[PDB]
Amino acid sequence: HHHHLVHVASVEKGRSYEDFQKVYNAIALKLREDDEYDNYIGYGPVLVRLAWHTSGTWDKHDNTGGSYGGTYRFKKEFNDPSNAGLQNGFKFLEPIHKEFPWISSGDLFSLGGVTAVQEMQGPKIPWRCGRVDTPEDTTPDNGRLPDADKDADYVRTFFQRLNMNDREVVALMGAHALGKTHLKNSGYEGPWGAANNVFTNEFYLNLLNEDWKLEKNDANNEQWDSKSGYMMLPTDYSLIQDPKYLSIVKEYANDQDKFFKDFSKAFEKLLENGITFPKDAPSPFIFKTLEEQGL
Ligand code: HEM
Ligand SMILES: [Co+2]
Ligand SMILES: [Mn+2]
Ligand code: NA
């Protein structure tokens, strides 16, 4: 059994590193300017989640979904219950897309995530251009993004569809250092940590070090809560119930640099799943932060 859907990366006509650095800079400047959003968390976390949700529809079996097509712009995916709240990220990106109308939707959504991680002091994420918009009938159906009310076996099985192994899964879930759950979006409420617009290994430290109590929230869903005001989803808590996940959680809690390196690889892989880069395509771009540019 096999399929023949191939998505070849095609560089936006005549564009090079300097063009994409300008898009990065525009995103980063707006992150700095529109910093009141979500009680001064800012838009960084929602842009990371947008990049992940637009990429995380991928199915390795038939190459449907994924970042290439930019299909979140279509109402079926836009209105996926799993994507509730991402509209805020999309709205943030609208004036960026207006200024740089040549960038594909896929490139913009993925670059938004890269920019957010880097501007929030995370590792450098190499990023490749060339995603090409595909039509409305290529939009994947709802239900390909993960449920939160599940255990480690669910998590492991879920992520096999994205060709992610245990280490890649645990690394990727470290992004929950950023932002928070919002009851109206997901039926869960609260942050995973304190410094939730700074990219760190705090998710792993909190998971291991806090005193967690299994509680019911105001939407009648179970979540783990600490006296510090943090929370963990059942899927997150499963990373310390499963012995193979627990070993990796401990590794990243004890070595931020290792987490950063593994996250960077896994996040680039996530954003590139399903894309064929031709042999003569440009090398991955590593963008400078605003702080690096003195901007
Ligand atoms: C089993 C896998 C996962 C589950 C079940 C899950 C679940 C959730 C849920 C329920 C929220 C709250 C949404 C809201 O109420 O606004 C959330 C937020 C978030 N997740 Fe995940 N997540 C998963 C994996 C990931 C991955 C792989 C990434 C990135 C690499 C990620 C990044 C984020 C970010 C950045 C937010 C914050 C959004 C904000 O503050 O606006 N998550 N996640
Ligand atoms: Co098939
Ligand atoms: Mn065939
Ligand atoms: Na400010």
UniProtKB/Swiss-Prot annotation:
It is found in: Mitochondrion matrix; Mitochondrion intermembrane space. The keyword Disulfide bond does not apply. The modification Phosphotyrosine is found at Y154. The record marks R49 as: Transition state stabilizer. Forms a one-to-one complex with cytochrome c. Destroys radicals which are normally produced within the cells and which are toxic to biological systems. GO terms for cellular component: mitochondrial intermembrane space; mitochondrial matrix; mitochondrion. The keyword Heme applies. The active site is at H53, W192. Present with 6730 molecules/cell in log phase SD medium. Its cofactor is heme b. Heme b binds at H176. It comes from Saccharomyces cerevisiae (strain ATCC 204508 / S288c) (Baker's yeast). Its EC number is 1.11.1.5. It catalyses: 2 Fe(II)-[cytochrome c] + H2O2 + 2 H(+) = 2 Fe(III)-[cytochrome c] + 2 H2O. GO terms for biological process: cellular response to oxidative stress; hydrogen peroxide catabolic process; response to reactive oxygen species. Keywords: Heme, Hydrogen peroxide, Iron, Metal-binding, Mitochondrion, Organic radical, Oxidoreductase, Peroxidase, Phosphoprotein, Transit peptide. Binds 1 heme b (iron(II)-protoporphyrin IX) group per subunit. This is Cytochrome c peroxidase, mitochondrial. GO terms for molecular function: cytochrome-c peroxidase activity; heme binding; metal ion binding; peroxidase activity. CCP1 precursor is processed by the rhomboid protease PCP1, which cleaves the N-terminal hydrophobic transit peptide. The m-AAA protease (composed of YTA12/RCA1 and YTA10/AFG3) is required for CCP1 maturation: m-AAA protease promotes membrane dislocation of the CCP1 transmembrane segment within the transit peptide to ensure the correct positioning of CCP1 within the membrane bilayer, allowing intramembrane cleavage by PCP1. Belongs to the peroxidase family. Cytochrome c peroxidase subfamily.
